[PDB]
Every structure is written in C-alpha cells, then in structure tokens.
Design an enzyme around this catalytic site. Structure first.
Site, PDB file in Angstrom:
ATOM      1  N   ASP A  45     -13.123   1.796  -1.308  1.00 60.61           N
ATOM      2  CA  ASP A  45     -12.611   2.078  -2.644  1.00 60.61           C
ATOM      3  C   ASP A  45     -13.754   2.344  -3.616  1.00 60.61           C
ATOM      4  O   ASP A  45     -13.690   3.269  -4.433  1.00 60.61           O
ATOM      5  CB  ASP A  45     -11.758   0.913  -3.153  1.00 60.61           C
ATOM      6  CG  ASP A  45     -10.426   0.789  -2.424  1.00 60.61           C
ATOM      7  OD1 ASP A  45     -10.067   1.708  -1.725  1.00 60.61           O
ATOM      8  OD2 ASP A  45      -9.783  -0.220  -2.572  1.00 60.61           O
ATOM      9  N   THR A  83      -2.484   7.024  -5.257  1.00 57.68           N
ATOM     10  CA  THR A  83      -1.545   7.521  -4.259  1.00 57.68           C
ATOM     11  C   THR A  83      -0.114   7.092  -4.549  1.00 57.68           C
ATOM     12  O   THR A  83       0.825   7.767  -4.112  1.00 57.68           O
ATOM     13  CB  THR A  83      -1.944   7.047  -2.848  1.00 57.68           C
ATOM     14  OG1 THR A  83      -1.975   5.614  -2.814  1.00 57.68           O
ATOM     15  CG2 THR A  83      -3.314   7.589  -2.471  1.00 57.68           C
ATOM     16  N   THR A  84       0.074   5.983  -5.266  1.00 54.83           N
ATOM     17  CA  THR A  84       1.411   5.603  -5.708  1.00 54.83           C
ATOM     18  C   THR A  84       1.832   6.404  -6.935  1.00 54.83           C
ATOM     19  O   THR A  84       2.968   6.888  -7.012  1.00 54.83           O
ATOM     20  CB  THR A  84       1.483   4.098  -6.022  1.00 54.83           C
ATOM     21  OG1 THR A  84       1.194   3.346  -4.836  1.00 54.83           O
ATOM     22  CG2 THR A  84       2.868   3.724  -6.529  1.00 54.83           C
ATOM     23  N   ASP A 117       0.845  -1.190   0.000  1.00 56.16           N
ATOM     24  CA  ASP A 117       0.000   0.000   0.000  1.00 56.16           C
ATOM     25  C   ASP A 117       0.883   1.243   0.000  1.00 56.16           C
ATOM     26  O   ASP A 117       1.688   1.445   0.914  1.00 56.16           O
ATOM     27  CB  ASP A 117      -0.932   0.014   1.213  1.00 56.16           C
ATOM     28  CG  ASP A 117      -1.848   1.232   1.243  1.00 56.16           C
ATOM     29  OD1 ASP A 117      -2.713   1.320   0.404  1.00 56.16           O
ATOM     30  OD2 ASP A 117      -1.674   2.060   2.105  1.00 56.16           O
TER      31      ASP A 117
END
Lengths: 67, 521, 156
Positions: free
Chosen positions: B389, B86-87, B53
């Site tokens: 999500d 977010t990555t 994550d």
C-alpha cells in the site's frame, strides 16, 4: 452489590456487602471470599474480551453470499 | 399521451444491465470506510471467508451477469493505476448508473447520457486538480506522512515510521525526479520468518526465496561473482520412453551407476569452463533443478548453486544482474553471465535467504528488492501488505502530484461546484450535470451511514460548511463527525480520486452502450 | 423461515443481507449457546455427544461439547473456535464465554431493531469493556486470610 456501590464513594457502612455471590448448594447469598469461591483475575478479563471480540466479528456481518 | 412504441425492446437489456450492476455496487457499498461492515462469502469450493476487501469481495462474488462483471474490471483498473479506491470507484459507478436510470425514465437517450456524463467527468478532474495540495517526491517527509497515514488502518501501525521511508527509498530508486509513470513491478518483496519488523532492508539488487547449497563442501557464498541462469535440469538421464537393459553381473550395474554420476559431473565441468561462479537454476516440474550428486560435484568445483528459483524471480535476475537465460547445456557460455560483488545466504533465525548485491556493471538496471523479516507469519505478511500500500500511495504522488483531503471532502466540493456550473449549461446537459453532481453524494452518504452517523445530518453539515471551506471539511470516523480533515490527517493522493472519476465514467459509458447480447460458438 | 429467493445481485448464488442475516446470526449463536449453557457451574448437568457412526460420550466439559457440536452456520463456528482459543490461553471458561457472547448478540439485535446502528453498538460494547476491566482491578485481591484467620480451609 448495589449496596456495596452506594457506600463506595463515602466508605461509610455497617457492612460492605461486597463480594457476595450465589451459594449453589443451599440456595442463598454468601460471602464468597470466606466461602472460598475464587477465580483468577485473568479468567474474568479474558472472558469478557473474548466474548466481545467474537460478538463484534458477527455483528459486522450484514451480508452473506452463498455460492 | 402516446409516443414511439419500439416493438423491439432493447430497453429490457439496458434495464437488466443497470439493475444487475447497481445490485453489485450496492452490495460492496456497505464496506466503505474504516467503519465499514464485513461480508461473508461461501465460495464454490465450500470454503467460507470473511473480508472487507473490496476487490476480494467482487472476485469471490462469482458475478455471472455479462455486464455486471464489468465492475470487477473497474476495480482491477483502479488497483492497477491507483492502487486504492477500489471500493469507491464501484460505489460511484453504481450511483451514476442510478442517475442514468432516472435519466432514461425521463426519455433521455443513452447516447446523450454517456456523452454528458463524460463532460461532467472532465470538469470533476479539473476540480480535483484545483483542490490538490502539491508535494515533491524529493521531500521524503511528505511521502512518509502520506504512506504512514494510509497505513493507520492496518493491524500494526507503529512500525510505519520505518516501513514508510523504506517504501520511499524503494520508489525513488526507480522514480528519478524527471519521471511521471512509475512501474512498481520492479520492486520485489521477499519475506522469510525470523527476526522482527525493524530488520528490513532495501536492497539495490535481487533477493531470492531459495536457499544455497545444502550439500557438504558448498561455498554458499561467492565474491566477485559471475552469475548464470540455468533453465535446464541437472539430473541423471531418465528417458520417458521404453528401454530394456539386461544386467547379469555387478560390473554392468557399476557401469550404469558410473553413467549417472559421470553425466552429472560432465555437466558440472562444462559449466565451470564458462567461468561461472553462481548457478541460479529455474524451477521446473519435469526434473529436479539440481541433483544432490550434482551439488556435490559443483561444490568440489567451488560453484555456488541456488536451486528451484521461481520463474518470476528469474525475470528479476535477468533484468537486474545483466545475466541471460541459458536454454540448454551446450549453450552455457560466459556471454550469458551477469555480475555481482557478493552472493551470500543470510541465516537470520533460520531465514535461509539468498541475496545478490553489488552489480558494479554497466548492465545494471534500476531493480529493487526488499528483505522482509519477522518472527511469525503474521509479522512478515503485515509488513508485506503495508509496503504494497505504501508503494502505491507514493506512486500516486509521483504520477499526479499532491494530496486531497478524504472523508468525502472532494465529493461534496465537486458536487457543489458542478451544481453551480450546471447553471451555465442548457438543455439535456444542464439536467444531466445536476444528476451527476447528486450521484457524487453516494460516498459521503455511505461514509456517514457506516460510521454510525445520521446520513442527512452529516451530508448537510458538509455542504453548508463548504460555503467557507474547500477541502478542510469531511467525515472523520475517529471524531465521529464532520471535522477538520487536515488536523485528523485524512489525505488521499490525487491519482486515487482522479482515477475513480475517470474509470467510473468509462464504466457507465460502456454499460449504457450495451443494447443487446448474442451467443457466439 | 429460511433466507432464500434473493432475486437480486446477479451472481451464482444467493444473497442474505440486512435484518435477514442479522436474525440468522442470532439464531445460530443461540443454537450453540443452548447446547453448552447447562454445563456452567459445579452443580450443572452433563450432555450426550453422539457421532455419525453410532458411538457417543457423555461429558460436562464445555470445550468438548462445543468442539464436537455439528454447527452449520459460521456465526456459531466463530464462538466454537473462540472457545478453542480460550483453551490455549486460559484453559477454562469456555462455557461462560459462549453464554455471554450469545446474550450480547441477542441484546445487540434488539438495539438494531430500535434504530441503533451496529457501528455504535460495537463501539459502545468496547467502551463498556474498558471500564469493566478497570472495575475488575478494583475488586481484585491477592492471597489473603492466612494470618490470624483461615479461609483456605473451605477450599480444602
């Protein structure tokens, strides 16, 4: 075991050569079904999967952070 | 030759800023994509975790550098606005910082770099909008498909056929058509063990984690109820100061015991005088929310009690039901009570879950609760995680309508577009735009690497294929190559890609503007 | 030898990545397997487990040997915890699972050095497993040799 796969597609053989294993007392190759060396199916299926799943978890680690 | 000496060397700070920030971005880079690699982290408390994550990695990375930590705020803003990517936004930031480093080495002032990158970012946003495949929040099938698709990477994907439309109805209850910004904080997910995944409800009221009355005689369910919020504790007097009492006969101790019982009853009776049917008591660590004896007295008064309710749950009760907090005992009055048609505890394989439903009052507000059930902790946790999500994906579709193909598709298209549009630019802007377009390729490059594919081969095939295609060509880990992004259902909401372009540019702007650091104490 | 002096990634700690952590993982899993390995089979030898106080026990039980092993690398703990799960589903085979797992990781490291991406190693291993299980179903047999012959007498 190689011989047991060579005749497999034809089913033409003098001997199946199948299910021959290690006699760990006399040091020779024996027919394990007659010798009596048996394991339940679930042991081999679970062992192969269990080893792989742990291997994947470790192979997926290309970074470690140590605080 | 020879040029400006700059005896004072703020460039040493700018170098340290980029070097530290790129190192963080390169680390998280390896986790991009469904085939991304896991990280091991040993935390400062000695606990060792494994996760892919992005946010968890950066949070537990324990970044110290005063500037590199900015990438944590970037992932927070990405999670706050989009809820996904977010990555990617961190990887893009790193690549843009690498572009900035090359530009700095060419003698381009960081003020020029930041301004030119912002201009390129504005064009990238326009390109993303052009690539959008528009959807409507009135079309549940479009939203269910978007949610279920993003959930394909979860442990249990099969029940998305039911969890997805639950997310849709949960959002639409608060996202009426004539809206843009949807605040998902009005959707409370309450989970208990027991039942299975199908046993999940979208509720038009407020659901609590706490149980009803434990003592004998409690009604545990009220109809046509007025509901009060108690912030005081109903417990025998226990002063924190010094008291000295002399007891010489049992009759004196009996009076003391009567004081403890009468005190609890006197509160219970004063509460009933307010015509309150259900007591929803805020949790506190000072004293017990409600004494066992108070539950006995309140039960005799036919009052339903729900104790030790979390502070956040109180905030949901005070918005949904029309009820108001009651700071003290004497302040407990009818004017502070809400409305509900039925308050009950539901026992589904021992769930012991309280639900307040049927407000039937003008004080009703668009609050949503979800009832999550499942035999094991992993079942209710995966359900909650999947809904979080799904809600974020749908929110994205409301704010910025439409989806854009994933797999690096917009990153190849935007890079090609800016590479050609840069040909109309002059001066430093033309060179910087080319560097911006190149930085974008870090995403399809990283995806190819993590998928086990040849980096250059995959990126080259995509760049050539986008001669004829626009968003249909991208990386599929399922097919292990460059294939049709739509047939493979590889779709990402516009907001996610748009936010990644904006936030990454803002971060680079903020980083490049740092020429110094001083202590202040 | 040890992986340190990262001098990169300005965080409150060290960074071990790439071939460094991969080789470390191989060393860890071999260190664990080297303990339990010799317990495999009815003819194997037992090993001594000594605690931090001064007492010890001798056993050939793979589950006990692994559980009571001091492992300082999580790469090895994964295999010890695997064995503990094995006991909860099968009750046996803990020795053979660790032995196989270590060999697969060592072999995988060689594939990485030969420029096979870890993703394609993981994929190939899972593809092999699917066929391996299907093969087991072919050599699978039921209770046999009771009519006209007896092999169960060799069990007794």
């Amino acid at each position: 075991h190689a011989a047991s796969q060579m005749a497999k597609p034809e089913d033409v053989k003098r001997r199946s050569y199948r299910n021959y294993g290690l006699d760990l007392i006399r040091g020779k190759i024996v027919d394990e079904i007659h010798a009596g060396v048996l394991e339940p199916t679930i042991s081999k299926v679970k062992s192969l999967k269990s080893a792989l799943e742990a291997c994947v978890a470790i192979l997926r680690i290309d970074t470690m952070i140590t605080v | 030759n020879a040029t400006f000496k700059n005896k004072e060397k703020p460039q040493e700070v700018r170098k340290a800023n980029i070097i530290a920030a790129r190192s963080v971005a390169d680390a998280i880079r390896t986790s991009l994509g469904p085939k991304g690699m896991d990280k091991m982290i040993k935390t400062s408390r000695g606990e060792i975790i494994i996760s892919n994550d992005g946010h968890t990695i950066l949070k537990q990375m324990a970044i110290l550098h005063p500037v590199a930590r900015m990438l944590v705020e970037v992932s927070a803003a990405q999670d706050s606005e989009a809820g996904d990517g977010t990555t990617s936004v961190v990887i893009l930031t790193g690549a843009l910082l690498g572009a900035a480093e090359r530009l700095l080495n060419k003698g381009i002032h960081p003020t020029i770099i930041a301004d030119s990158f912002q201009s390129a970012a504005k064009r990238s946003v326009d390109i993303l909008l052009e690539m959008c495949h528009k959807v409507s929040l009135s079309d549940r099938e479009q939203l269910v498909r978007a949610a279920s698709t993003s959930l394909s990477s979860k442990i249990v994907s099969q029940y998305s056929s039911f969890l997805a439309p639950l997310a849709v109805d949960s959002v639409l209850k608060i996202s009426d058509e004539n809206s843009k910004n949807v605040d998902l904080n009005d959707i409370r997910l309450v989970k208990k063990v027991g039942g299975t995944i199908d046993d999940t409800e979208m509720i038009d009221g407020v659901v609590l984690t706490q149980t009803a009355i434990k003592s004998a005689g409690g009604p545990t369910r009220k109809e046509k109820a007025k509901i009060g919020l108690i912030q005081f504790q109903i417990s025998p007097p226990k002063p924190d100061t010094e008291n000295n009492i002399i007891v010489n006969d049992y009759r004196q101790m009996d009076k003391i015991l009567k004081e403890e019982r009468a005190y609890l009853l006197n509160i219970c009776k004063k509460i009933k005088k307010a015509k309150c049917n259900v007591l929803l008591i805020q949790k506190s660590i000072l004293r017990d929310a409600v004494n066992d004896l108070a539950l006995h007295f309140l039960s005799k008064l036919n009052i339903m009690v729900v104790k030790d309710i979390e502070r956040e749950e109180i905030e949901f009760l005070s918005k949904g039901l029309g009820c108001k907090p009651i700071a003290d005992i004497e302040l407990f009055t009818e004017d502070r009570l809400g409305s509900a048609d039925l308050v009950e505890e539901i026992d589904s394989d021992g769930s012991k879950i309280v639900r307040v439903t049927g407000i039937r009052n003008n004080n009703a507000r668009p609050t949503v609760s979800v009832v999550i059930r499942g035999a094991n902790n992993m079942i209710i946790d995966e359900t909650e995680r999947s809904l979080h999500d799904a809600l974020c994906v749908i929110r994205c579709l409301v704010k910025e309508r439409g989806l854009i193909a994933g797999g690096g598709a917009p990153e190849i298209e935007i890079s090609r577009r800016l590479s050609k549009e840069a040909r109309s630019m002059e001066g430093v802007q033309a060179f910087i735009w080319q560097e911006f377009a190149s930085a974008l390729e870090v995403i399809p490059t990283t995806l190819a690497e993590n998928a086990g594919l040849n980096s250059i081969k995959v990126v080259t095939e995509l760049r050539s294929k986008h001669e004829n295609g626009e968003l249909n060509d991208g990386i599929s880990v399922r097919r292990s190559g460059t294939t049709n992004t739509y047939e493979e259902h590889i779709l990402q909401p516009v907001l996610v890609s748009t936010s990644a372009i904006t936030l990454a540019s803002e971060c680079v702007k903020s980083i490049l503007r740092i020429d110094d650091i001083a202590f202040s104490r | 030898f040890n992986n340190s002096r990262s001098d990169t990634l300005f965080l409150g700690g060290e960074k071990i990545s790439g071939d460094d952590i991969r080789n470390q993982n191989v060393l860890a899993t071999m260190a664990v397997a080297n303990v339990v390995k010799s317990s495999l089979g009815p003819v194997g030898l037992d090993k001594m487990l000594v605690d931090d106080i001064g007492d010890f026990t001798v056993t050939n039980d793979g589950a006990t040997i692994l559980s009571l092993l001091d492992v300082q690398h999580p790469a090895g703990k994964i295999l010890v915890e695997l064995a503990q799960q094995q006991d909860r589903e099968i009750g046996d085979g803990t020795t053979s699972v660790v032995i196989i797992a270590s060999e697969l990781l060592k072999r995988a490291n060689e594939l990485v050095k030969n420029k096979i991406h870890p993703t394609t190693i993981i994929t190939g291993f899972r593809v092999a497993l699917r066929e391996a299980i299907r093969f087991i179903n072919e050599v699978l047999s039921t209770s046999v040799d009771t009519l006209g012959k007896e092999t169960l007498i060799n069990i007794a």
